[PDB]
Design a protein around this ligand. Sequence first.
Ligand code: CLA
Ligand code: CLA
Ligand code: CLA
Ligand code: CLA
Ligand code: PQN
Ligand code: SF4
Lengths: 90, 159, 147, 62, 41, 80, 34, 29, 742
Amino acid sequence: SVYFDLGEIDNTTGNWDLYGNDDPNRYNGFQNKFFETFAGAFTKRGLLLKFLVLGGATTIGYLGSTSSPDLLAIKNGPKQVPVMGPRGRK
Amino acid sequence: DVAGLTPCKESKGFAKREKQEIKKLESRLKLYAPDSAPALALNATIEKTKRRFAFYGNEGLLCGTDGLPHLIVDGDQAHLGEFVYPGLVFLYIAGWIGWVGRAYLIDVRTSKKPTEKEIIIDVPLALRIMSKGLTWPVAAIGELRSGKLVEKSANITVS
Amino acid sequence: ASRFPKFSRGLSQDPTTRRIWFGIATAHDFESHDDMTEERLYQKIFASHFGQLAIIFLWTSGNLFHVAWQGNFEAWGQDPLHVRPIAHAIWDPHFGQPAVEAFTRGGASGPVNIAYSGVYQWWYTIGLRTNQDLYGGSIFLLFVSAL
Amino acid sequence: GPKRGSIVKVLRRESYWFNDTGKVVAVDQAPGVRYPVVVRFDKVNYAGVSTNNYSPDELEAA
Amino acid sequence: MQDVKTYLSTAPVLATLWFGFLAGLLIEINRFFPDALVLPL
Amino acid sequence: AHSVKIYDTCIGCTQCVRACPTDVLEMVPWDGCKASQIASAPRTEDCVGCKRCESACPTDFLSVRVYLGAETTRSMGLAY
Amino acid sequence: MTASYLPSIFVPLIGLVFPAITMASLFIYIEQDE
Amino acid sequence: SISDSQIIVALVSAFITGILALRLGKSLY
Amino acid sequence: EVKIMVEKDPVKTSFEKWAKPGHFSRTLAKGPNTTTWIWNLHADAHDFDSHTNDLEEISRKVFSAHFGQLAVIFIWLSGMYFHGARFSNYEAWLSDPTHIKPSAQVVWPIVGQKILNGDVGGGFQGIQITSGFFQLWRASGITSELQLYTTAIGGLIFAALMLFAGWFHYHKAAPKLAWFQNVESMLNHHLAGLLGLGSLAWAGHQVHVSLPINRLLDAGVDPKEIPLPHEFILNRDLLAQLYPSFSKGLTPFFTLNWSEYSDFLTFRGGLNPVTGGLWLTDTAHHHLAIAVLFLVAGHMYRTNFGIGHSMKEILEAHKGPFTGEGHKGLYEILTTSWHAQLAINLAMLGSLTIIVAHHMYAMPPYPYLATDYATQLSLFTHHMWIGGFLVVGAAAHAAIFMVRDYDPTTQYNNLLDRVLRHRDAIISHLNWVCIFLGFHSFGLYIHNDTMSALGRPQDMFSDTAIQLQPVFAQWIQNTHALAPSLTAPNATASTSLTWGGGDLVAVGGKVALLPIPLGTADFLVHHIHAFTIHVTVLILLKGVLFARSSRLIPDKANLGFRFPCDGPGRGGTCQVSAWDHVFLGLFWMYNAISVVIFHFSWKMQSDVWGSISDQGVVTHITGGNFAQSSITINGWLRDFLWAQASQVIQSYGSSLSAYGLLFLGAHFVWAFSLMFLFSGRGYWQELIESIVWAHNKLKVAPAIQPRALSIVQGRAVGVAHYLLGGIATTWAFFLARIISVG
Ligand code: CLA
Ligand code: CLA
Ligand code: CLA
Ligand code: CLA
Ligand SMILES: CC1=C(C/C=C(\C)CCC[C@H](C)CCC[C@H](C)CCCC(C)C)C(=O)c2ccccc2C1=O
Ligand code: SF4
């Protein structure tokens, strides 16, 4: 009937976890082993940020450089004649 | 003459500014009978236009390269009727207003509830002061000479 | 001095987002910083002045290099009334074909901008007639900015 | 300090009524009062009050 | 009758009476002396 | 963290402390005005800058002055 | 334009990658208590 | 810069100037 | 129980309280120390519940103020009728309503303004009006200036009458609180008596005078040869010449054999093919049905005659699981607080004004109304603005009630309490949906603009590129188009011509109405309308809910409804009251209504109006460029603002010159508003000191000390000037366009 206490302070501050599934294992052990041996080295954040930046740099480089003529419009260039200057300029 | 403007009664661009307007008015006029209120109003407008255009040329204003009067607010004696002659009467009227307002404030300030006499005017005193406010220059200069015009113990403060 | 603004304690102890904002605002008010004396202030002014001069000269060298590399200065020199001065070239991957055909005016081979800054007439008056002169000026300005 | 009902002019530099006149109401004659003179003015300030207390050396013009 | 005069001595009523009289004066002057640009004096 | 100050012109109106909605200002014995009362700001660590204090002192200019300083969680009035 | 392959190399490396890395660096420097 | 090597010269000089600006900024902070 | 209650002579009429300017409130009755007295005098001049505290005097003042307002409205109406009688080309208009422009105002020739009296036709010269009074008088059967004169006098009489009542019921016989509280009998009498009998009387007037006169006007006879409206009352045979059903006397109505009244009591959709308006034989039937509806609906609530409902047992009976204690304690709210009633009344009246503005343009009820484009546009815009103002007023008064009339000691009735107890959820979800709508409405326009700018129109959101056809509106149109065959077998045609069904109707050249198409350009603008309405509701509802308290200021209700800010503390608390939320919502209401009226103007000029020629070819005004050019903001800039604004700007030297002048005047007023909207009181209060110094130097210091406007009056002035400038600009633009090109 009382909603305060100094001992159980977490009961009187709303620190409960409203949705907690304490299940320790949900997937196939073989599949988990085959997933952690491949996505395990990606844990090192210090060696992942400097990997992502270089990957993205080289990716937008190769794709930015080795593009296609039909795909891009700024790469296909002008294929017509230029209009003239309103005051007889070029 | 002055400023490269010709007088208006010789401007060959004023004639057009007159005849075009006249012809527009007549085109408007030809949509009624010569004995109806619109026709009378339009004929009155045309007569007013003629009377207006036959006054500027006689006054002596200088027209422009487009046929429009131009005011020489310079002090030129041949053009005093443009700025200084009306300016003097305006200054007279404005000094009148200011002087009578100042005098009303001065008189009201020495009363019981001076703030009451500013949302509820007392028409006798105000009328008296408005009447006496005809010779305001002879009073303003007299108050200046007599050292009664300005204060010295102003209540401005800045820390 | 343990958070983003290290020159002030009032903003360091600020838990709110305001700590960020007022850190960028009061970043050049060297007078109202922490532990400031009249000999650190003046030297910071001196060094910031040197940095400002460096930035100005880098900007000018960039203008020179970009008019020399992509501009049509030489063509403009021999017909300064029937040609448009090119500022630089544009490479926008969002463009469409009509936009490329529209902005490819002048004499350039691709789409470019037209210089409305008057640098062409200035450089031509003082005696510059070839992209080589513009490139020499650009590298010299890089050098003086480095200095 | 000054007499009752006396018209004195203020000298407090941070007063709304600086260089203005006002009539004393009643100066307190206690031993340790720092601002005993009480003066009421005929024009309110930005807050709306018209009475204020000063020290005798802070206002006098008669 | 005294309070009626006091009410007629108010600021808005005197203001509107004065401005209406002045508007009438100026309107009559312009209806009799129209298109005045230069003082003929 | 704002800085409150009480200059020696308080006539002991007690309005400053009545108005402050944070229990920051309190009365204190101090002889000299009329009733040996004066204001005091011991709990300035809780003032938000409400300036309700300054809007109450009927002194010439003022006797209680709040100077807005370093901002914190208590002074910002946050509840989240 | 002599190179004409550099504008395809640089503006992707200056309008996409440069902000992407400097914003991350500045966010790490801002949100740290030292 | 109508030539090819001149662009590389400009690039390396800009890089040197960048390192110099980096050192200056570090000294200013 | 329910009886007459009056207190004989509660207030002596005199001039004593008249000489003392401030008398209602004791705080400012003393006098003007500073110049912020003249202002708050007029500010709380009408704050009846602030002067005193008893509901009785407040109610009496409210009653008498209502009577004064009615008197002013009667003077307005009598003036409009007298002008239509004396300075109007009405009789000439009646002889040729398709070539004579309406006009009921002439200007004295004084300073060259004579040219405002343009050539409207019929031998007349005056400003062309757009009130639609000529069409209303033609539909009423009015056919002579005499019949106007009289009614003018009539109005004047009522005016005096109203004034008399206004005095009487405050000074000689004023009721007491217990009388106003009888809401059951009040609703009984407003339903059965005011609406029911009013509709029945108007149906009588229609069926007796308005039908034969208008029918003879449609048959092409001279409006002077038409018999007078009483020759059809004292001669049933002269009236039966048109509707022979009258020959059967009043017998069909009493023997329930009134299916023989199908002559003048019809049910036919569409518009009259010659006047471009509804069939008056249909509006008579409509009013006859509405009258009996309201009459039988006026017997619901209980009076002292035993039977009837009571609006307290009705309320408490509705109390569900989810919603606490139901509607309990709301009958106590709406009978002991004038604000909680004004809120609901203003909201409903504003919404009703919007409904009226939407209905009248689509079903023109007056003859030759859809033809005159200027009148049909003004009647839309005016009513839209009125509704937009009234809804914001409703919000403001709900906030006022919540601030100073609500109390919890009786409001443990968990309906208002429950909605007050999850405001942090209501406002959060409204904020999220506002953001979602804003993005998915305006970002589409930005997409279209960027694409049409990047030379790639194939990636736009047009009707050729990716399509956003509104399917639900199209389905509703197709459903209403087929109603007179399946879901309305007795109605001869659809209710309106705007539905996809039907065909075109002409009124001698210009087109009246036709089926309106709906494409992507309409999808986008409808979603924009929804977004702006949602943002306005967000602001107003946030203000109303947080009018009492919030996390920032838990004791805001102690401060009041109207106050600038609670200090510069807590980071800053400027504009924290409900009055400031109304201040902020006025601008968004302005935005919304301006977008609505722009939508209507362009869509009508583009896809509805025009002038058809023989063989059927119809060319709209702009040329149907709304479906393609309204998908990009640049299109609204050039094809609507730049293009259509080309009539007002070059209107100098013509009869449409005043619009060209008021264009720039309203621009100036709008820009003037920014000085108050951007600045603050401290700078001006300081600057005024340096002028008071120069005044003291010359002994011209006023006794009423010149303080600067309060922090709330600055905002009030700013928003007032802003709204005036904007609405007057749009007014001048719309009129100068449609008068010349419509
Ligand atoms: C401040 C001077 C300045 C400015 C505003 C520009 C602007 C531009 N250059 Mg550029 N450039 C400059 C100097 C400048 N340049 C110099 C001195 C060189 C010689 C090394 C170059 C060499 C160069 C090449 C080779 C290319 C560009 C390109 C471009 C365009 C795309 C941006 C880009 O990729 O930059 C990339 C910039 C560099 C690779 C070098 C930067 C040069 C200096 C060191 C930067 C100056 C620092 C600056 C003052 C500090 C800014 C502070 C600020 C953030 C507050 C853009 C119009 C591209 C283009 O034409 O696209 C159409 C392109 O391909 N530039
Ligand atoms: C026969 C003349 C007469 C006289 C002598 C009085 C005398 C009095 N009335 Mg009264 N009254 C009258 C007629 C009269 N009334 C009528 C006809 C009505 C019905 C509308 C009322 C309704 C009424 C109410 C509801 C109240 C009074 C009150 C009062 C007392 C104070 C009035 C005061 O100072 O305000 C003077 C007010 C004015 C001069 C303002 C007049 C503005 C009018 C009403 C509206 C004009 C609108 C007009 C169209 C302008 C629109 C805008 C325009 C700028 C474009 C005083 C005893 C008050 C009272 O006793 O409370 C303590 C009060 O609350 N009267
Ligand atoms: C049924 C309509 C109705 C009624 C009866 C009321 C009644 C009331 N309102 Mg209210 N209101 C309404 C509609 C209504 N309102 C609408 C539609 C809005 C939205 C804009 C508001 C917004 C509103 C606010 C924000 C406030 C009120 C307040 C009040 C109360 C005091 C009003 C007062 O003294 O004003 C006196 C009247 C004036 C000072 C006139 C001001 C002049 C106006 C703003 C300009 C008019 C422009 C005009 C059309 C043309 C301009 C040009 C010309 C002047 C030259 C009073 C109970 C106040 C309050 O505290 O309530 C208790 C308050 O703060 N109302
Ligand atoms: C044109 C000016 C303008 C604009 C754009 C806004 C925008 C907004 N106001 Mg607003 N407001 C304005 C003027 C303006 N206001 C003025 C003058 C007033 C004074 C009356 C107000 C008063 C006001 C109030 C009182 C409220 C708002 C609210 C809102 C928001 C509504 C949510 C929404 O639709 O999000 C949509 C946002 C947009 C359409 C902005 C454009 C976004 C573009 C299309 C996307 C760009 C793509 C990408 C992000 C760009 C990256 C750039 C990067 C690469 C460098 C929104 C942010 C309400 C709010 O907070 O609700 C959440 C609210 O309650 N305003
Ligand atoms: C200009 C301005 C002022 C100052 C403006 C004031 C004081 C307006 C007062 C001007 C009027 C015109 C004075 C009244 C003149 C008398 C009616 C005199 C009548 C006689 C003739 C002149 C008609 C504020 O106080 C303010 C406050 C908060 C936000 C913005 C602002 C703001 O912008
Ligand atoms: S508005 Fe008045 S209160 Fe609110 S912040 Fe600005 S100054 Fe402080």
